[PDB]
Design a protein around this nucleic acid. Sequence first.
RNA 1: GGACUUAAUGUCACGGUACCCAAUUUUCUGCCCCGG
RNA 2: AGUCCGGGGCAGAAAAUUGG
Length: 1237
Amino acid sequence: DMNITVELTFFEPYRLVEWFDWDARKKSHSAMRGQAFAQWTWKGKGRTAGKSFITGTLVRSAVIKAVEELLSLNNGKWEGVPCCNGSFQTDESKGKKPSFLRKRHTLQWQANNKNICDKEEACPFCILLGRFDNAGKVHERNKDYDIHFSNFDLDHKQEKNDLRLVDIASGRILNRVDFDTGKAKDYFRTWEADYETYGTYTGRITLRNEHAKKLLLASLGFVDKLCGALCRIEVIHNDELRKQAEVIVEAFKQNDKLEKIRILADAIRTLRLHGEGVIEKDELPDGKEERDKGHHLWDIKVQGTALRTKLKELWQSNKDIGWRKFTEMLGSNLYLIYKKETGDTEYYSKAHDSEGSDLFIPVTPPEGIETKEWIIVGRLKAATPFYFGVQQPSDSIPGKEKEHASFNILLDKENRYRIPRSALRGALRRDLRTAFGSGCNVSLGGQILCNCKVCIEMRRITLKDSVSDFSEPPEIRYRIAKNPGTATVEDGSLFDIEVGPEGLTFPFVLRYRGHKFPEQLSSVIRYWEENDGKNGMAWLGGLDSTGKGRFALKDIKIFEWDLNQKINEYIKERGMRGKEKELLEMGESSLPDGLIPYKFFEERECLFPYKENLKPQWSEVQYTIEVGSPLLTADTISALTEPGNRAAIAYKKRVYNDGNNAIEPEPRFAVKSETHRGIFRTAVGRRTGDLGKEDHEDCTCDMCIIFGNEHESSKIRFEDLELINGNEFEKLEKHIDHVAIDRFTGGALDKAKFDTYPLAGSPKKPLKLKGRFWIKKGFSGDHKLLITTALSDIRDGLYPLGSKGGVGYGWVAGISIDDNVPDDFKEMINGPINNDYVHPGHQSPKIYYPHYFLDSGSKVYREKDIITHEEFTEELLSGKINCKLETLTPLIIPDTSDENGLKLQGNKPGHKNYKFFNINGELMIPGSELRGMLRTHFEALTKSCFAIFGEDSTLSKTLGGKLDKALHPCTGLSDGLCPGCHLFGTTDYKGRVKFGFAKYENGPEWLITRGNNPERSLTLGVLESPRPAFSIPDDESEIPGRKFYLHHNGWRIIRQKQLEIRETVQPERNVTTEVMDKGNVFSFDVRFENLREWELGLLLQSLDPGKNIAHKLGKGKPYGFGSVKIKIDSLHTFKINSNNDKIKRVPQSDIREYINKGYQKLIEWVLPQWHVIPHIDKLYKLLWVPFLLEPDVRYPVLNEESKGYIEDYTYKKLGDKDNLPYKTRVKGLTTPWSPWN
RNA sequence: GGACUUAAUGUCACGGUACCCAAUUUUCUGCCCCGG
RNA sequence: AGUCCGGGGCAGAAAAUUGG
Ligand SMILES: [Zn+2]
Ligand SMILES: [Zn+2]
Ligand SMILES: [Zn+2]
Ligand SMILES: [Zn+2]
């Protein structure tokens, strides 16, 4: 008669499955999969929006479980009303079994038989079961049930609008992972809903009988499991943005930037990290300061207006959907615009086909025992960034079946990071399995309960979903798949990961309902705890091998309730299900009645199972690296934002303050753990020689076990490499510019200036890089010594951290070990040569021209069979070459980052004030300078090709067509490759030789130039861009060759006529800087790996040409500035085999049996005689230094200079076709020291 | 409240981490000669 | 035939943004 209506208060994302029909359930095994979940209904025939509900039989079963447990904990004394065990058996005559069996450990008593119960004085348990009711199972046909559990429809939130399924349910994927491997054994769909809006259900229950109210109310207040989540029970633009993306893609298409229709989309999606003002306040980075072209991508005129203003207008017209939801949507639209033109297994196992035993299994607790419960709550901090997976992007489509980018992180409808309950439960399962030492892998579909070692405690433990107290867009980490064959990027190798920020805190609960608190839980809770040394090791989440998902549970507080005497207080309070947020900050003085904290908790070093199989599983050892060279991490995509106009910037992490909200304003510069892993993997592969094989799917070599494979999870996992020595520089970030000098004109290419922007760092003050790497307790002695050798290879600087190693960036120079108990791995870790070759150089030993051309004909040889960049080869040499860079003439190397370094701009506005290159206040030399000069020298010596050529040019058109089809630059790696690029390295192939940064640390610091008018500096004559029109004027003449300058003491003229060139003419249109003195001792290194024997000698004596020959460096090369010669200190060589652990150097007997092989090989294309070769003689003639006589070399003037031209030999008489025809002009620029007079 | 949507003497889906391999990267001197 | 002429033109193109 009297009716009860109750509400369902959900405090965790529940589940719901399409109901279909009972007869149609067996058709869809997902139906029996979701019989314990909620249900969904469809109104129309077009699968339109409907309504959701939970079956009344489900809440009936929940009530039955609640009464069974409550009566079992009460020992059958429910306020003096005994209850019988009850009947759970069917098939009395012909079956008629209920739609759901039990297959559960039913709890009963010893006897529990006060009297025989019939349908006259039935027990309250009988009434709740309704065994003696007046209704059957076939159909209702009336309200004849003693107790009725009707539908539980929605709350008031379900207005008559017929809410869409998308607004209430979201598609999701649930996984399962085996122990020994790490691959997803099986995945299946799920429809995890939300508890924010549609988190309440209302249902009506009827109880015709009277002697059942107290137990029913106690059960209703005791149930804590409903649809798969906690519950509290009480009694009561896609079209306009699509068109815009199409328009902008078409505009970029006619803008010839067909390939560039993706890099702007990447940066636009990156804009969600930044605020509205990143595109609204003023603009994206402006770009070139004075080129009158703007930024190479953002200041581009699209549909008339600039791209930095067209998108601003778009934002102004689309402010409705906010910043994040507009930026992400526009990025997805751009991805779709580009992509419009450019198997796994499931396992549900919910069926009765296995068997039909369904045997009753009584389980009676022992008499006199005390059963308690424990709630473990705290904060789950993440000391490392965390990534959580999700189904394919934009493929969720809830309610239907059969952005688009990256591996999206899991976010709720609130659009913030969240740890799914299932992931935390699985991590706990794995950790408890490790603590036990043995168990059974989870196999679904089992009709009988799995009596595993760890499965027993799973029935008695529960935990809830966790959501961030933080809502910001996540950064997008970049990963590449570099081929070990060529150490570069191949097709289909880049992808994106949307990791979160480190330091974020999460709520975390662990409620255990068992007889006694197990020691394994008490050990794993300290294993996760962040103690003084443990620091937490909860590897919860995804990409655990890479280094993401190492949570450290913190601030653990213990509470326990009573189920034997204080059950009714638990019934009243319901265990604070959903109130754990207040429980986090609820102090010791505000505890409710009972619920004393569990005071039997022990310390970390007190439990046996912790020290047996919990902590030994991981042995973290932290090592600090110092680097004496600038470091660059290639964050180019993020460089298309923030002021600076720089095409290459370092990668910066993002951390969250502990105890303080929001991100610190200063980002943490760091090296990605992904590169930390890649360098180690490449090193171990090259030492083992197993890189470059077919695959590692079924392989079991030295690589698959240590670093994982397609099947098994990696047994080594790393962490982010962060820089700790940050606040000790005040100039931590240093700008360095790079150019690609044309080999035909001696100047910059048409469009090749690739400016960079790396960190700072000096050999006397290095960047302290700190990190850690984890080892599991299964590596044998050989593998441990192998990993120590892996560290030792970094100790010798073989592998450069960061990018652009071939210049000298990020050269490690030693690793130190901390005192975090690393003792497991701590224990395991003559005269310089000088060539005597002398060149005569008797072209004019007793008027010249500064730059000469080197014609070498059309004879070109290229090596089709490229030498792979795989594991080190024993016979091919590899090592370092220490050298002394000796300065003869003043050396002029400007730090072009600061155009006002000399602070002379105030006296002369608009005058460039360059400063000498220096890193962290110490004298340095750009590695790229030596790289380029030595590459030019080697290529000209080998006369192979033109490394950099200025194609598509007009000279007095088609300058690239005049050059014959044999000297073209290094094309793809199929038709051939330049021998000069075979060693130095062309595109899509890493060069084996990595140049270094020189550290002088000796000699006079400055060229004082006593008596000079300029103060603590000097001036220099303004230089003009080359005009190759006069170089190759005649159409009949084909092309000149390489451009080489001459060596002379021409700096004396500049140092003498300084006032006549800096004050008389060009008051502002001039460049000035500081130069070096003579006799400056230097030291720089030239590393290499896997070099052929015959190329090593060429490299060595092209480094040191010999006596009376020096290399040209710095500006003012036509003016004679910067004549320097480098002499080898000692050529080293290391042995791959561990037998020869110590490194060796070649004998100092003039480096015997090395250069002669290359000298002999050159004739195909005892002391060496390089003047017996037509082109080497000319090459060495141009580099001859006739000052260690004094020839004078200078540019002539057209008609009359401002101060000079003492007199003939001007640009008219020489330029006239009669007095000096152009036919002999090329001859005069090719023959060294021609007699122009 | 009937009506979309359940049977009732019996659901461990707290019976399952979208978990796994793939180094944002190699290559490039901040260089300098005459032409409407 | 009739005097001035320049001292800044490059300031990144080119290679991958999907495969088991
Ligand atoms: Zn009874
Ligand atoms: Zn088990
Ligand atoms: Zn293998
Ligand atoms: Zn080449």
